[PDB]
Structure formats: C-alpha cells, structure tokens
Amino acid sequence: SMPLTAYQLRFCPARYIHESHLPAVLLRLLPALPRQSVLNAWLLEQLELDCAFRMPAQLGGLALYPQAALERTLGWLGALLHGQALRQVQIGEQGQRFCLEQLDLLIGRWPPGWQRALPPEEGYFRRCGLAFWLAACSDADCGFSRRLRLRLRLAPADWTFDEQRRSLARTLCLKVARQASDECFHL
Ligand SMILES: [Cl-]
C-alpha cells in the first residue's frame, strides 16, 4: 500500500513504469534483472523525461498513488464519464454503484461533451479517467504528464477545457478520488 515519493517519481521511472512502455530492445533485454539505478537513468534518457517539472497543484499530482488506488481512482472516473450511456443498458461493486447512483449528485448538470458513448478493450475506463485527469491539469509539464501516462498500459475535442470547465473538471476529479480510495486521498 506504500506510495511513491517525489524522488522516485522524478528519478526512478523503473519503479513504476508498465512493461507495455519499455523500448522494445529493453523489453527484449528485460528478461533478467529483477528497480536498478542504471536502468532508471537509462530510461530517463531514452525518453526525454524532463526531471525539471512541477507537480500540478491541489492533488492533481496523483502520480504518487499506490498502483491499486491509482487504477481504482481512474477506473471509477472513466466509468462515471460513461454513466449516462450505462443507465440505458462491475469493476468493484463499490464502483459500479458509484457510477449509477452519484452520476447526477456530483457536479450538477453534465457539461456538453463530458459524458461519452460506449463502444471495449480491457482497461478502457482507466485510460479514459487518466485522459480526463490530465485534461483537468492541462498546464502539466511534459515531465509530469508523461510520467503519469507511464503507469498504465497503451482526447476528445470537447475535453480541451479552456474556461470554468477546467475548474469544474478538477472538482470532479477530486470528488471521484475522495470516494474511490479515501486511504490515499491525502496527496
Ligand atoms: Cl470493491
């Protein structure tokens, strides 16, 4: 249940990167070597991962969650963004219920493009919620955003928030998170 530290987030990308993202050769080279200082540095190089980067204000910096809470928080969020589509037809009972019951008890009316239609590959909602999370902290340095993205495997025009909607997106994010895992909401 242990979180990551700013140091490990800034300098130890191999502590939290998903094998999905390793450069092919290193994936191929990966088979040995069970979190090692040279790979951390070599990963920061192969990807221009600026170690000069600010953590998005007010807890946007969820790049430090334990993986489990991270995947839960973003899954609940991606599900919620498909709430309406889902009323018209279960990754955690707690989360299934959250999406159906709280859809209209969170941010009032749903801004015009926030709710989306359904098609779904595996992990689809986690990626949706992650896309939404980054869009809510949009000034995020390529160093922050690129590192959060690395914690999951493999955005709609109406999510380029340019107004009060951005301030409403941050609020939805924080509320979904406050319920999706209270354990690690202190971040
Ligand atoms: Cl659950």
Side-chain angles (χ1 to χ4, degrees), residues 1-9 11-14 16-26 31-34 37-45 47 49-53 55-58 60-89 91-92 95 98-99 101-108 110-121 123-138 140-152 155-161 163 166-187:
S1 186
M2 286 160 293
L4 284 168
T5 79
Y7 182 96
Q8 303 172 291
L9 175 64
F11 300 109
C12 308
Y16 57 81
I17 197 188
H18 188 279
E19 312 200 358
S20 157
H21 296 340
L22 304 171
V25 296
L26 168 52
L33 331 129
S37 301
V38 67
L39 295 141
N40 285 358
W42 185 31
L43 282 163
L44 285 181
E45 174 225 22
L47 319 156
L49 278 174
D50 239 40
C51 290
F53 70 76
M55 297 269 279
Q58 38 161 215
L62 124 143
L64 303 165
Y65 269 43
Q67 194 71 8
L70 183 48
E71 291 192 0
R72 187 156 145 112
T73 296
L74 299 183
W76 284 25
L77 178 62
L80 189 77
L81 296 167
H82 299 69
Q84 255 150 29
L86 283 165
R87 270 185 179 165
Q88 312 161 0
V89 191
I91 52 117
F98 174 74
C99 156
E101 294 183 75
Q102 305 283 315
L103 174 70
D104 301 290
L105 302 170
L106 292 159
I107 63 169
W110 275 96
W114 290 20
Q115 290 284 319
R116 320 288 307 168
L118 301 150
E121 219 219 80
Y124 163 92
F125 292 95
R126 276 178 313 251
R127 275 124 43 185
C128 279
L130 172 59
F132 194 84
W133 198 278
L134 291 172
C137 45
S138 238
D141 289 298
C142 260
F144 175 79
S145 309
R146 294 180 56 208
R147 289 176 160 78
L148 194 45
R149 290 221 166 72
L150 294 179
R151 302 199 63 192
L152 314 177
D158 282 292
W159 283 11
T160 302
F161 314 124
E163 43 143 41
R166 174 178 319 102
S167 152
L168 185 60
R170 302 182 215 115
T171 299
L172 181 64
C173 284
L174 299 163
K175 289 189 179 190
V176 182
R178 166 152 177 74
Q179 297 192 46
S181 65
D182 87 276
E183 57 249 13
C184 348
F185 186 74
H186 63 270
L187 296 154

